[PDB]
Amino acid sequence: PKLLNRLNTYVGSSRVGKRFKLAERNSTFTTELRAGTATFLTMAYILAVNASILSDSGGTCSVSDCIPLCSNPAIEPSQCTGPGLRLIQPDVSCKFNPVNPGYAACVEEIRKDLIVATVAASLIGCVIMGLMANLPLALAPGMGTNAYFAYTVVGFHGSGSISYRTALAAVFIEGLIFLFISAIGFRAKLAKLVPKPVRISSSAGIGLFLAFIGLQNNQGIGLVGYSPSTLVTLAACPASSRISLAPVITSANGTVSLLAGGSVSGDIMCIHGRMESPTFWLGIVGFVIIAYCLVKNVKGAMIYGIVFVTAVSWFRNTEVTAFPNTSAGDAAHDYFKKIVDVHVIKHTAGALSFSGINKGHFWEALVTFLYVDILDTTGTLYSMARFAGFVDEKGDFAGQYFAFMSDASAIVIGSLLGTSPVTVFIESSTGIREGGRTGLTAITVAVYFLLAMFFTPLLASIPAWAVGPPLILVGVMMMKSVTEIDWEDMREAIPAFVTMILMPLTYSVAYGLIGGIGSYVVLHLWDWGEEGLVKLGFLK
Amino acid sequence: PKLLNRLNTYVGSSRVGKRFKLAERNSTFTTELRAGTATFLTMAYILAVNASILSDSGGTCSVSDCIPLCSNPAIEPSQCTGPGLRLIQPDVSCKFNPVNPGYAACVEEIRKDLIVATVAASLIGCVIMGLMANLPLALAPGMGTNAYFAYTVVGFHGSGSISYRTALAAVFIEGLIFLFISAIGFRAKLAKLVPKPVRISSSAGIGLFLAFIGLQNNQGIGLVGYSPSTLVTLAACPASSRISLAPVITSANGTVSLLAGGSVSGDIMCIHGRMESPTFWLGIVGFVIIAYCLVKNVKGAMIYGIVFVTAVSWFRNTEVTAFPNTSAGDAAHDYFKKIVDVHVIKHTAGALSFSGINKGHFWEALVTFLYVDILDTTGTLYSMARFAGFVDEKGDFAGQYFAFMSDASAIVIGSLLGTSPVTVFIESSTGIREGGRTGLTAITVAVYFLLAMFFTPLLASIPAWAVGPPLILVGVMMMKSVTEIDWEDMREAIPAFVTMILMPLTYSVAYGLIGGIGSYVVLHLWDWGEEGLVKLGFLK
Numbered sequence A, B: 001p002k003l004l005n006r007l008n009t010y011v012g013s014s015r016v017g018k019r020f021k022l023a024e025r026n027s028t029f030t031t032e033l034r035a036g037t038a039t040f041l042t043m044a045y046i047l048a049v050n051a052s053i054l055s056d057s058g059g060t061c062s063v064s065d066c067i068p069l070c071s072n073p074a075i076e077p078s079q080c081t082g083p084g085l086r087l088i089q090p091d092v093s094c095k096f097n098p099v100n101p102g103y104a105a106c107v108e109e110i111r112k113d114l115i116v117a118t119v120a121a122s123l124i125g126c127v128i129m130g131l132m133a134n135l136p137l138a139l140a141p142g143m144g145t146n147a148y149f150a151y152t153v154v155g156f157h158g159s160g161s162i163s164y165r166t167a168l169a170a171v172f173i174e175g176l177i178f179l180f181i182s183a184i185g186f187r188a189k190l191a192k193l194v195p196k197p198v199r200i201s202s203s204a205g206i207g208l209f210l211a212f213i214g215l216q217n218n219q220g221i222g223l224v225g226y227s228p229s230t231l232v233t234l235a236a237c238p239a240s241s242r243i244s245l246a247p248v249i250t251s252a253n254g255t256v257s258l259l260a261g262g263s264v265s266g267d268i269m270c271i272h273g274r275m276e277s278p279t280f281w282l283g284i285v286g287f288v289i290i291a292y293c294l295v296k297n298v299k300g301a302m303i304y305g306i307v308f309v310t311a312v313s314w315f316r317n318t319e320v321t322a323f324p325n326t327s328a329g330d331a332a333h334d335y336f337k338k339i340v341d342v343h344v345i346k347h348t349a350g351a352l353s354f355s356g357i358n359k360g361h362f363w364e365a366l367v368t369f370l371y372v373d374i375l376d377t378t379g380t381l382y383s384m385a386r387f388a389g390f391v392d393e394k395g396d397f398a399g400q401y402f403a404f405m406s407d408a409s410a411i412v413i414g415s416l417l418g419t420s421p422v423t424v425f426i427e428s429s430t431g432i433r434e435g436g437r438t439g440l441t442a443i444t445v446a447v448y449f450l451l452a453m454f455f456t457p458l459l460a461s462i463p464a465w466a467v468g469p470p471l472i473l474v475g476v477m478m479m480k481s482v483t484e485i486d487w488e489d490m491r492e493a494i495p496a497f498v499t500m501i502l503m504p505l506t507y508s509v510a511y512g513l514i515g516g517i518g519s520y521v522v523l524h525l526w527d528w529g530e531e532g533l534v535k536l537g538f539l540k
């Protein structure tokens, strides 16, 4: 017949084919390859988004990486010897605007490390799932955990209450706890512990949080900027027309004086030229591209949008350039010039630190990671099994036990490599729809991730306005869970709304979850007391 | 029979009873009285929320009512004569933090005007609807337009692009345009101009916008404050631990110098004591009270939460007091002492100004007022028409023609009195469910508004944390429309998501409408272009 059919039958009748149960699942080798290719195309936006998001966290970079700066900007620090001229020792404010060049270079190195870490974590998770669980599921650092880890647990450039190393330890212990509870069967009980409206609306809240991130400046396309009165207004003015803010002291006359040691923001206040930034409009074009490719059921929509925006931003002397005419931009372009590079993780791998265990914020982050991972994986795996028709009458799909252990072990491995918790993407369904039934789909995705490595220079040059629209569209897709909330019932609507609005507004998944659970408990206190009195017999 | 039955038969058979068609609609006098009482209780929260929101707009007064202040705060301006001592002439910054005592005396006076304007607009609108349309519908300044008018069109203390007087002309002309198109039958044609996903998700977007306002400081309970890195984090620290912000100029050193003339914010940045403000926790208790009363189907749920929080805030020497131990607090308490007062509108009535017609921002507000009023009234009026069973096979309910002109005429009257556009409340369904069928229900509601006056001192003493939870809980109810969006269709989900998320984030109803309509048009260009070619014949 055809060489393709010969390869298919040879693989299916081989030892590997029987090990992967290719014949028993009605697909042998080319269907698995196509399913893996489709899954990788649909999920490969993570290679950009996760790396950029976790890089905004600052990584292991600290004040010790900040170089001393001269008294005047016109003199390079080596020539900073003269009358009235001195070297300014860096403090905590070196991490934030204006960012110390040494810290920025360290953050770029951390970005390369995090690209490699994302690739390696996705590869290892896919290999573990394909081999030990034998399911067509691809694993990679999850988006919700990505944003929560970067901008809430650690904060922008380590401005949060938990350091990057302590957050890595939190992710590691979270993965260990998830593996422990999965190995016994308490995972379903801890999943049912979360109230149904809160559990359903957590996905929509995380989507709103991701879209809000995609609508910021250092994070996405802009269009949302600081407002003195409303706190938030229309951004997307050019970067030349953005100014910083610092805390001040008011009085009864108006002597607004600067607060010494205040944490100056980035460039978030637009003075003029609203809706005129070319980077925002390039992001909008990428958003339109991804939206049309999603409408047309085109696999790799976010890939195409990110690639288009990044390629437009790769030109050197434009207003949308990813390599500005600065020392940092020159270094970024120099690294981008070498298309291929085998980058070795230097600062991020094995950067765990268990020093902050006794702190409450560490355990808040750990519990939020654990609940997000449990709910996400429980929903996703069973949705996949219903997609692949692996669900029996009992509601199980055979390899679920090893699937959950694979997810937890991949979380632990990714924490060791220095990334936010990794989980099974819903994009895996794209492979299942293509005919993927065995673990060879996961192995194909892992090989594609391997080929994604060696392109770290090509991936480290992706600007914020390219990260941008993928975040908003991920929010759009995650917003579909709102239809499962009984909005007519206030005991269901109010907790769901509280979660859904507190995740983007408080800008924290943990705070949204806490508020939703608290509101649910408070609103059901009356009903629970009534049923308790009835059970005791005081009421009929 | 009983004495009550005698009243029902006498009124029903009288000239008034036949004029109102009490017999023909199977309810004569007491049912209308209970329906009017039920509608008013479910709606009376607007007596508190509307005036408080529109007061933050700054009202009709300018810097011209800011008093000159002495150079040092320790000397009253009359004694500001000495060496190195001078009177500081007020500038634009007198309106904002720190607020000039002269301008703070406006908002207290303006709030009293807006309380009467809220009642008089509600009273006149109900009477017009009850008499000319003969429907059990109550009219009041609509929550959809209050916040947009105050915080977006005019801005906080007149910081927006349109003055309060010019915004009143926008409402006045909006009422005239709405009356004209309704009178000629083109209202339905303009209603279908807005795309379906944008029209449905605009209600959810305004609810998120209102709930966000309920989570601010000058607007609601707090819990959302400024963040140097994320622009929003967890507020609800005590007012003593909140600090202002001013724009600064960064460099390559760190010499952040204050930007002269910068617009200093309020007190939005928490330094310490997060989740410790008693006023936020008092608001949370009021949130729980309304939430349970909403769960238990208790009419007037939002009154009880507002009244409870306001009553606790009426004590003089607490941390949740509405009358702080200041000159403004003493004056506010002094007015609160007289329980009854017949306040006469002095600054707000007849404060129209057509000077800003040529400006683009005037027409952006005018069109947004028109579409919000058109979509709200069309959706709201036909909503109760099913409740009262007035809809025939053709889809109209007899008095619909005068129902829309009653709404439009009341908008013109409300603008003359100086309030945000008034509309038919969905809370009118409460009286209809109680049996209200004629215009006597609206007249009964209008009479309750007469009693709402003579209590302006009792209503002007309502703190921000009392407005608070009603704003959040209104957003919960308006959130139920998301279930009508086809979230699986990206051509419907993306425009709906953009409409829904831009209203709180850009903090503007107009921007959410523009972005959602713009994204809808772009996402349908391929479909419209393909269909257009088929009509031309180039494609099959």
Ligand SMILES: *[C@@H]1O[C@H](CO)[C@@H](O[C@@H]2O[C@H](CO)[C@@H](O)[C@H](O)[C@H]2NC(C)=O)[C@H](O)[C@H]1NC(C)=O
Pocket (backbone or CB within 6 Å): A251, A252, A253, A254, A255, A257, B070, B071, B072, B073
């Ligand atoms: C406004 O009031 C303050 C005191 O509340 C005046 O005092 C100044 O305060 C700042 C810092 O608090 C000092 O740097 C100044 O040296 C103080 N000046 C004096 C004369 O004491 C301040 O002068 C007042 N500002 C204006 C413009 O009048």
Ligand SMILES: *[C@@H]1O[C@H](CO)[C@@H](O[C@@H]2O[C@H](CO)[C@@H](O)[C@H](O)[C@H]2NC(C)=O)[C@H](O)[C@H]1NC(C)=O
Pocket (backbone or CB within 6 Å): A071, A072, A073, A088, B251, B252, B253, B254, B255, B257
């Ligand atoms: C860093 O460089 C800036 C100038 O670019 C210095 O700014 C000082 O403060 C204001 C703003 O320019 C000027 O009036 C001063 O003349 C500036 N000083 C000098 C010597 O020019 C700033 O001094 C530098 N940062 C530090 C800590 O010295």
Ligand SMILES: Nc1ncnc2[nH]cnc12
Pocket (backbone or CB within 6 Å): A141, A142, A143, A144, A145, A376, A380, A423, A424, A425, A426, A427
């Ligand atoms: N956290 C997550 N869970 C499932 N699928 C995802 N795709 C991207 N992030 C994901």
Ligand SMILES: Nc1ncnc2[nH]cnc12
Pocket (backbone or CB within 6 Å): B141, B142, B143, B144, B145, B376, B380, B423, B424, B425, B426, B427
């Ligand atoms: N704008 C509005 N439309 C209908 N009902 C409302 N209730 C409060 N505000 C309303």
